[PDB]
Structures are given as structure tokens and as C-alpha cells.
Amino acid sequence: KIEQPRWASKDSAAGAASTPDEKIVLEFMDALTSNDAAKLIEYFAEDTMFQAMPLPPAYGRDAVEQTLAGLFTVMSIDAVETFHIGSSNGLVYTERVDVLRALPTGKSYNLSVLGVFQLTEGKITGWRDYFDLREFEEAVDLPLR
Amino acid sequence: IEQPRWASKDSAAGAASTPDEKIVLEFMDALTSNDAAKLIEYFAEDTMFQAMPLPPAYGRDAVEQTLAGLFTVMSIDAVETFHIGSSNGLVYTERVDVLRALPTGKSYNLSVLGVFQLTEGKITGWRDYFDLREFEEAVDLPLR
């Protein structure tokens, strides 16, 4: 389904977790397809934040969970393909496609996402996904902003 | 530029710790030249650029035309890289690009997460992820 971008690194290491933190992030990417904020929130420290960057940030584990829960009321993460994962300084970066499916319309969209995760002691203390919201909105006829 | 509330206070977070990251950080600063002919020197011949909301440019020439194209309507006034990291020949920059739309004189602080692939110190891929509409609406400039 998810084609390898032409620009994807052909260094096969780039797409695999090479550290405990990158491993957690890829496990978390897999967990995203649960569409289950209660499951996902277990990856997060209390002192954390989440931001789909087109949308407002959620600060604190509670806000993260409820903000995630809110997203999963309207969209399913059907698949997450991480082409590149890297990390430095406690930040993990993921270049991904998230196959998103708007529940109201049933339309799916391959969201090109570059995500950054701050981990502290194996828990997510920051997760920001960068992507273009409009193209997603217009594709799936789902008003998010 | 205000450091986001989530910006690593770890000072090594925003600092290049590898030759690639150094090149990228230097490239970020070189973006404020708004000079596609200067910028393209950072790029390998086999390269690509994509502001991810917009079509990619493949090939050094296509990247230069695209950057030159972007600079006719947009000034990169500042690039603040909060976070830079790298693995496996990829450099990641979490940044704010202070963008100023030339036709409107309006500026916007664009939250960008960018990825750079470098081969032998040359950029073989540069993809910036951000939300275009927020930028378009902030600067009254429909780039799409």
C-alpha cells in the first residue's frame, strides 16, 4: 500500500530503530494504529506534550490523552510507515506516512509526516508531528481547522 | 524568536554535533540569503527538495529553480533551529522559519520540522514539513 518515497534513504539502517528510544518510538508508531488514547497515553510522561503542529498543542499527559482521544473520535490511524528514524540529544525523529481514515467520510489519506519525539527515561515527554493539515482536510472532507 | 515551551533546554539539542549537522545549520543560516544560486551549492547533483505541502523538486537544477522561485515571493528573514539531530545520514531540524511574503510585506513564524539527507557533505534531500495554510493565511499569500 504505502510506496517507498523516491527520496527515502536507501541506507537500510535509516528506517530501523538503532537505540532504545527509537525502538520505543517505532513501537509507539505501531501503537498509533490502536486509535486508543488510553493505550497510547501509557507511552507518555505526566510532564509531556503533544502537538500535531497544524493544531493546538496539548500540554500534560491528561491534555495529551484527551487531545489524542479527540483525534481518534474522527480519524483512524490505519497504518504508520516510518521511512526514516533518527535521534540525537534525547529527540527521536520519524519521517513517516500515516494512513489516516476520516471516520465521518470513510476517506483515507496518506499523510506525509515528520515527527519529533522527546523521550525521558523511555517515556514520551514531547511529540510533535509536522504535516500539512489542509491537504489532509480536503482529501478526506473532514474539517479540522 | 520565542523558544517554544517544548524546546529542549539541553543546549546540545540546538547545536550541531556532527559535520552533517554543522553543514545543515550553516545551510539554515544561508537560507536568509534568499539566494538560490548561493544555496544550491549545498546540494548534490542527485538531490531533491520539497516543502512537503508543495510538489517536490528533483535534481539540483529543479531545486535551484524552486528555491529561486520561492525567493521571488518570500524572504527567509530568520531560521531558528531549536533542535538538530541526525542518524543514518539524515539530519533533522526542528525550526521556526521567519518568513516574510514579499507581495504583502507580512511575516509569519513558520514552525517547521525539516529533514536533510547528506552524502559527502552535500544535500541529497531536503524536506521541510509544516502547515502551508497557516502560513498562507498569516501572510495573505496563497502559495498552493
Numbering used by the authors:
A (entry chain A): 4 to 148
B (entry chain B): 5 to 148
Share the article's original sentences:
We report an in silico strategy for the biocatalytic synthesis of chiral N- and O-heterocycles via Baldwin cyclization modes of hydroxy- and amino-substituted epoxides and oxetanes using the limonene epoxide hydrolase from Rhodococcus erythropolis. We turned to cofactor-independent limonene epoxide hydrolases (LEHs) that normally catalyze direct hydrolysis of epoxides by positioning and activating water at the active site. On the basis of the well-documented mechanism of ReLEH, a water molecular is positioned by H-bonds to N55 and Y53 while D132 abstracts a proton from the water, enabling a smooth nucleophilic attack on one of the substrate’s epoxide carbon center. We have rationally engineered the epoxide hydrolase ReLEH with construction of a general platform for Baldwin cyclization reactivity of hydroxy- and amino-epoxides and oxetanes.
We were pleased to discover that when using triple mutant SZ616 (Y53F/N55A/I116V), the tetrahydrofuran product 10 was obtained in 96% conversion with a 72:28 enantioselectivity ratio (e.r.). Following the docking analysis, the epoxy ring O-atom of the substrate consistently establishes a hydrogen-bond interaction with the protonated catalytically active D101; the aforementioned hydrogen-bond network with water molecular is terminated by substitutions Y53F and N55A, enabling the substrate distal hydroxyl moiety to form a hydrogen-bond interaction with the deprotonated D132. Furthermore, to better illustrate the bond forming and breaking in the Baldwin/anti-Baldwin selection pathways, the hybrid QM/MM scheme was employed, enabling the calculation the activation energy barriers. It is of interest to note that the shorter distance d2 allows a relatively low activation energy, and hence the formation of Baldwin product is favored for the two variants.
